[PDB]
Amino acid sequence: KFGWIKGVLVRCMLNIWGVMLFIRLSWIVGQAGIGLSVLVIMMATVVTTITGLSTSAIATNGFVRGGGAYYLISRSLGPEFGGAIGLIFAFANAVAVAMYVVGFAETVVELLKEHSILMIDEINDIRIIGAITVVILLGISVAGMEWEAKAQIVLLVILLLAIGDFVIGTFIPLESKKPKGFFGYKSEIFNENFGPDFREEETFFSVFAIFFPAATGILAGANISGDLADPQSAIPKGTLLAILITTLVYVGIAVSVGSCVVRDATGNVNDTIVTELTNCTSAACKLNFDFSSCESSPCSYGLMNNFQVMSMVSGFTPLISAGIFSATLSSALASLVSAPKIFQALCKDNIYPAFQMFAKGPLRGYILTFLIALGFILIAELNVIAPIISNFFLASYALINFSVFHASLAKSPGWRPAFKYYNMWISLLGAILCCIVMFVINWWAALLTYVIVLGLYIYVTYKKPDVNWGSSTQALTYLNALQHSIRLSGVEDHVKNFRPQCLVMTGAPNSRPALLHLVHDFTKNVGLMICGHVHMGPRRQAMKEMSIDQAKYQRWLIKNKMKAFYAPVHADDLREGAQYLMQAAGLGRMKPNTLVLGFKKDWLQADMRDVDMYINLFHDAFDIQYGVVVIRLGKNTIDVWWLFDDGGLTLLIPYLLTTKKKWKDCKIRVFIGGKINRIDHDRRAMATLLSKFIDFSDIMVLGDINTKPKKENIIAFEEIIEPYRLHEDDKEQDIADKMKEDEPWRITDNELELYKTKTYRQIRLNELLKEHSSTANIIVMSLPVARKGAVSSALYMAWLEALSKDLPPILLVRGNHQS
């Protein structure tokens, strides 16, 4: 709504123009020459303008919401890059507050000192002034924000008036100021000052580090507003014009003041000499006064001895002092307002669990910024505070540049910048340049910040995959999931690599959570697991019914650490819903390949037409070549049994179960029955086969299964199966037919006589399980197959019941006959 001139340009100029303009720029152009100071300014401008290009490319995506720098970085790029940059930038602003207020306090200290007033000491006076100013600025930061927009332009015009006052006063040389080194545009002085004169321990990159804060603040200005009209258009123009204007002004002032004042001089109005020109080495040869003592012994005034040379050279000192005040305070306030906001946004997004508290809306953010600022203000020296802010802001800018380059390098799903002059290789160059300069200024601090950065990046990317942590950009999650699924579909598995992709169908999802938990146990990071539910009734209400049920069951599953996808369906009967889930559900390679059906607990009482369709589900699944699993219900062991191996799924499942922590204590015992003569050969061959795939200790072989079982179990079988026996032998054929055609689902007696052997052997198998595997936590066998049409459903399920009569947890697993 603001526009761009009042929304970015003004904000960026007031954030950029800070302490260094009117305090250390003279000192910097004194230490180094005009040439290397201009090179310093150009280096800073190059770093800031490359970062400006990267930011403009960031801000031209369609994600234009919220209104905060961290918001743009997080929503356009990954959450982890967003979090890292947000935290580091928040800290950088928290310390920049201290820098600006310390500069202001130093100015007030000197201003009082030149007068009669004074306090206990310079350093302690700086501490007191900085603390009180920080208190006042924070107090303003939460109340007077309704006036900052009005006062913004006033501050900028006052700052510009101060710059104009300095430049105008430059052109008016006076004899009063001449002792202090202010001569005025003399080619001898320009020649003297053009060369480096690093006097104290400082070097090139020390002055570069002390100056860089003169160019930091491009993001802090406008991007954090994000409430502009057409943010896709305000930011790229505003930032890239603010940078140009500020750099031009900096270079102009540097060259001018370097060409206007001599390196060091004293305030002695005497010392004027015209007597001799013996040496006249100094650039003050016109007079030369007696600055030889100044260069040989300590002297107060000069270019380097005192930093407020701009105050003296100016025509009017109150105006330039007001300029310094405004330049420091505006940027201090901007930083102290932009740090807690990022802290609060980070807390709300809850990227870092330690920072999960927002103080009920953001006392935590203000308290952190205040404590960091006050802690650093206790250092009352500015040439030692400037480098650490330089390091933190180079860290932020390097991270932004590399993040943009990386999001472009990997064709990220939601990275279409739509900007001109944004080549990603330039961004990579900016990143490496920032890192190298960070290291050259101070290698160990750069190392420390970068290990912190890498730790944060890895921690966020990997150690937090669970809930997405309040990410409003669930659209980016959708895009990433779509890309992942597309990539998986593209990858064609010539070898199927059969993984457990279950389709668990039970009816009421919450009736038997035990089956779901057991399925969870062997479906951890190995394959898919889709629930199922067929909903009967009119479609009009059913639409709302599944609309609610999908949500309710999916988050009920999620809260149980369940990787469950709910797949509700509407059908005229259970079999139709089974078919719908069976043939359609599953995208690309995530196609379910196993059907896990919950066993009927009380089929005795329920009408057995339902039994018929529940059993026909087995044939329907088999006809499509689905592995069939049926379930019925650490301290003990496990038992695995089978009569055949078709794909090894029956053997593979317990291996998957044991690998988990809960079942780690449990152990698998092999339980089979083979030829009595070939017990040793079969045992050795199967032990070798298992070893080829899985440790084992014992292999029980029960080759006696062929003979008839005990009388009691057989009897119980007949008193189980009698009610639906055809009675074809007992009744008359034609008389029986009147029941057969209208009741064709009766237990086929002819099958009973034909399948006596199957009944006997399966009953004996159940018995042997009873004696042997009673103590096992869970038992596993191969699910018997009854051919369609040849065998009635009722007989098959009677066989199943006899197989699973009064036993601990029991599973029946048959593979799909595919390797």
Residues 374-433 that bind its own copies (CB under 8 A): 406, 409-414, 432
CB of 14 to Cl ion, least distance (A): 11
Residue 677 burial (10 A CB sphere; 0-12, 13-18, 19+): exposed
DSSP 132-174: HHHHHHHHHHHHGGGTHHHHHHHHHHHHHHHHHHHHHHHTS--
Specify which residues 197 forms β-bridges with.
none
| Cα–Cα distance for residue pair 329/134, rounded to 1 Å | 10
What span, in angstroms and rounded, lies between the C-alpha atoms of 734 and 332?
104
Q: Is 693 in the site for its own copies (CB under 8 A)?
A: no
The answer to whether the CB of 333 falls within 8 A of the CB of 137 is yes
Type and span of the H or E element at 258: helix 231-260
- Identify the residue among 7, 13, 14, 18 touching Cl ion (CB under 5 A): 18
Q: Which stretch binds its own copies (CB under 8 A): 34-42, 243-251, 477-485, 789-797?
A: 477-485
Q: At 44, is the secondary structure helix, strand, or coil?
A: helix
For residues 153-174, one letter each, b for 16 or more C-beta atoms within 10 angstroms of the residue's C-beta and e for the rest, the string is eebbebbebbbebbbebbeebe
Residue 291, annotated as binding a ligand: no
The residue within the footprint of its own copies, chosen from 43, 251, 569, 633 (CB under 8 A), is: 569
- The residue from 8, 23, 214, 721 that contacts Cl ion (CB under 5 A) is 214
Question: Is 136 annotated as belonging to a binding site?
Answer: no
Exactly one of 7, 9, 14, 18 binds K ion (CB under 5 A); which one?
A: 18
Of 56, 3, 416, the residue nearest 232 (C-alpha): 56
Amino acid at 778: I
CB 245 within 8 A of CB 5: no
Instruction: Please check whether residue 300 is in contact with residue 306, taking contact to mean a CB–CB distance below 8 angstroms.
Output: yes
CA 427 remoteness from chain centre: 22
CB of 486 to its own copies, least distance (A): 5
DSSP character for 601? S
Provide, rounded to whole angstroms, the least separation between the CB of residue 391 and its own copies.
15
Count of residues in contact with Cl ion, rule CB under 5 A: 5
What is the DSSP-derived secondary structure letter of residue 535?
E
Residue 374 to residue 295: CA distance in whole angstroms: 38
Report the distance separating Cα 487 and Cα 413, nearest Å: 12
User: Taking contact as CB under 5 A, which single stretch among the options 12-20, 221-229, 299-307, 724-732 is the one that binds K ion?
Assistant: 12-20
Name which position in 117, 200, 354, 462 contacts its own copies (CB under 8 A): 462
Find which of its own copies, Cl ion, K ion, none residue 232 binds, CB within 5 to 8 Å per kind.
Answer: none
Residue 157 or residue 481: which is nearer to its own copies going by CB? Answer: 481
Residue 221 lies near K ion (rule: CB under 5 A): no
Among residues 695 and 771, whose Cβ is nearest to its own copies? 695
Name the one range near Cl ion by CB under 5 A: 15-23, 256-264, 594-602, 753-761. 15-23
> What's the token pair of residue 586?
């599953």
φ/ψ region of 818 (left if φ > 0, alpha if ψ in -120 to 50, else beta) reads beta
Restricted to residues 525-544, the positions that interact with its own copies (CB under 8 A) are: 525, 527-528, 530, 539, 543
**Binding residues for K ion, how many (CB under 5 A)?**
2
Report, in Å, the least distance between residue 99 CB and Cl ion: 8
- Give the nearer residue to its own copies in terms of CB position, either 281 or 474: 474
Q: Which is nearer to Cl ion, 216 or 594 (CB)?
A: 216
Q: Which residue in this structure is represented by tokens 């580091």?
A: 88
Among 481, 754, 785, 790, binds its own copies (CB under 8 A): 481
Applying CB under 8 A, does 456 fall inside the site for its own copies?
Answer: no
- Residue 463 binds its own copies (CB under 8 A): yes
Distance in angstroms (rounded) separating the CA atoms of residues 24 and 303: 10
Question: Residue 217, annotated ligand binder?
Answer: yes
What does 555 bind: its own copies, Cl ion, K ion, none (CB cut-off 5 to 8 Å by kind)?
A: its own copies
Residues whose CB is less than 8 angstroms from the CB of residue 701 and which lie 6 or more positions away in sequence, other chains included: 672, 673, 674, 679, 682, 683
User: Minimum distance from CB of 451 to its own copies (Å)?
Assistant: 7
330 assigned ligand-binding residue: yes
Q: Which of 464, 499, 660, 731 binds its own copies (CB under 8 A)?
A: 499
C-beta of 437: minimal distance to Cl ion in Å? 17
> What's the angle, vertex CA 216, arms to CA 445 and CA 137, rounded to 5?
100
Say if residues 93 and 390 touch (Cβ distance below 8 Å).
no
Written as six digits, the tokens of 464 are: 């937090």
Residues 616-655 that bind its own copies (CB under 8 A): 623-625
Q: For residues 525 and 528, give the distance between their C-alpha atoms in angstroms, rounded to a whole number.
A: 8
Q: Interhelix angle for 79-114 vs 69-76, to 10°? A: 160
- Any known ligand binding at 19? yes
User: Of these, 169, 217, 568, 654, which contacts K ion (CB under 5 A)?
Assistant: 217
Nearer to Cl ion, 84 or 101 (CB): 101
Closest to 380 (Cα-Cα) out of 126, 639, 652: 126
State yes or no: 798 annotated in a binding site: no
Interaction partner, residue 585 (Cl ion, K ion, its own copies, none; CB < 5-8 Å by kind)? its own copies
Q: What is the per-residue binding string for its own copies in 589-608, x denoting contact by CB under 8 A?
A: xx------------------
Question: Annotated binding residue at 16?
Answer: yes
Residue 291: CB minimum distance to Cl ion, A: 31
| Residue 523: CB minimum distance to its own copies, A | 10
Residue 221 sits in the site that holds Cl ion (CB under 5 A)? no
Q: What tokens does 566 get?
A: 């709910």
Q: Is 630 annotated as a binding residue?
A: no
| Contacting residues toward Cl ion, per CB under 5 A | 18-20, 213-214
Annotated binding residues for Na(+), as ranges? 14, 17, 327, 330-331
Pick out the residues of the known binding site. 14-20, 89, 100, 213-214, 216-218, 327, 330-331, 393, 397
Specify binding-site residues for K(+): 15-16, 100, 213-214, 216
Binding residues for chloride are: 18-20, 89, 213-214, 217-218, 393, 397
